[PDB]
Symmetry: C2
Subunit: 245 residues, 2 copies
């Protein structure tokens, strides 16, 4: 499984600051073995695709479930492809908990994006009260099934385990907590889908990943990469990409 590192810029930047970030990335010594994707604000996807080396992928941070229509404020997979971006992040925690996107909606978006040819980075993760109540497994398998029941071709899917309590809080999961969930998710995949799908699907970890804690998380057997937030806007993003060196 090729190591995968996604940087989720979220709602940050302007042309000057993203321009510099991009300059840095195009010049950096990035591992030949890491697949890199930058998640840019919709307003800057064209710019980013124009500026980043072709070796680095571009992802939209969200999309709707039909190619066109009366959905003021939304963008579709067709438009994302039009600009040259090849991925979309769906089901991120902020979409679920701040904007109210349900599993039903997320699963409809995944099927559409995939039908249109985009790769999908599908996020799942439990909240602190769920973790403490001992139902992490129940929650992540329910979120994963909603996605999985809408996936016809797993070759372009990346699963991202983003425990809510860890996003932007500095409270990274320990290597052991991450490994535990990843291993379980891989297991779900083997019995609900197939062994072939289980072995080739990347499951990445997100939630307060830094240049300082990445090497330990990355040595875990079932951690295939990361979905970086806050640190994807900094130069250390380069150290993250190279977490195996």
């Amino acid at each position: 499984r090729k190591f995968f590192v996604g940087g989720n810029w979220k709602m940050n930047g302007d042309k000057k600051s993203l321009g510099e970030l991009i300059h840095t990335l195009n010049g950096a010594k990035l591992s030949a073995d890491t697949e890199v994707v930058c998640g840019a604000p919709s307003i800057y996807l064209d710019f980013a695709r124009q500026k980043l080396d072709a070796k680095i992928g571009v992802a939209a941070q969200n999309c709707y479930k039909v190619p066109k229509g009366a959905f003021t404020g939304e963008i579709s997979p067709a438009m994302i492809k039009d600009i040259g971006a090849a991925w979309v992040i769906l089901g991120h925690s902020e979409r679920r908990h701040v904007f109210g996107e349900s599993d039903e909606l997320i699963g409809q978006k995944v099927a559409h994006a995939l039908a249109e040819g985009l790769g999908v980075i599908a996020c799942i993760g439990e909240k602190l009260d769920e973790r403490e109540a001992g139902i992490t497994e129940k929650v992540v398998f329910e979120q994963t099934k909603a996605i999985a029941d809408n996936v016809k071709d797993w070759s372009k899917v990346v699963l991202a385990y983003d425990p809510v309590w860890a996003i932007g809080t500095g409270k990274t999961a320990t290597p052991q907590q991450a490994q535990e969930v990843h291993e379980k998710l891989r297991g779900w995949l083997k019995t609900h889908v197939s062994d072939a799908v289980a072995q080739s699907t990347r499951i990445i970890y997100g939630g307060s990943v830094t240049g300082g804690n990445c090497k330990e998380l990355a040595s875990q057997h079932d951690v295939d990469g990361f979905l970086v937030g806050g640190a994807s806007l900094k130069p250390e993003f380069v150290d993250i990409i190279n977490a195996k060196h």
Copy 2:
């Protein structure tokens, strides 16, 4: 009051078809007495601003309420301005009823966009059930108040009366039902804000406006222009712009 015509492209277009539309608008003879604004999909805001003649303004179809932060999928007023866009459409019916944005949130969005120096096109309008119930006034005044409560300076606000039952259905409001609400909204402003605000704020009508309909709508004394959806993607958009000529 300068006649105002805004075209809301909604979730439509690609670089090819939008380039086409923009070339049409750039070569058309548009009335000098009409303020024209095109609301493009976020992904094409930069593109649109770079290709359109300077006399045509560009609007974002939506924005969030803070300058930056952990809001995957959202854009801010600072980003819109970065691109050179001068307006944002907020409170659109699709945002309210498909994406569940509340009056409270819409108000926070207006306050922030205005603080950031953008012009705001704020939408209000009742549903068919409300109209039939005879509570059109109750509903629009409440939505208007939610906006008003967040407007310090009315010089960069355009109120858009967009009855939900008229949006994309083909069921245009009659010239008399549009005038009746506009007049009532203008009176609301007069008594709740000021005579001067009342006199100067443009109140535009949206909901199945066509080249065929526009002239009679535009002749109503309190109808200051239109918010066009479906017809904004056609040649006839030109005729709408020129409705008073």
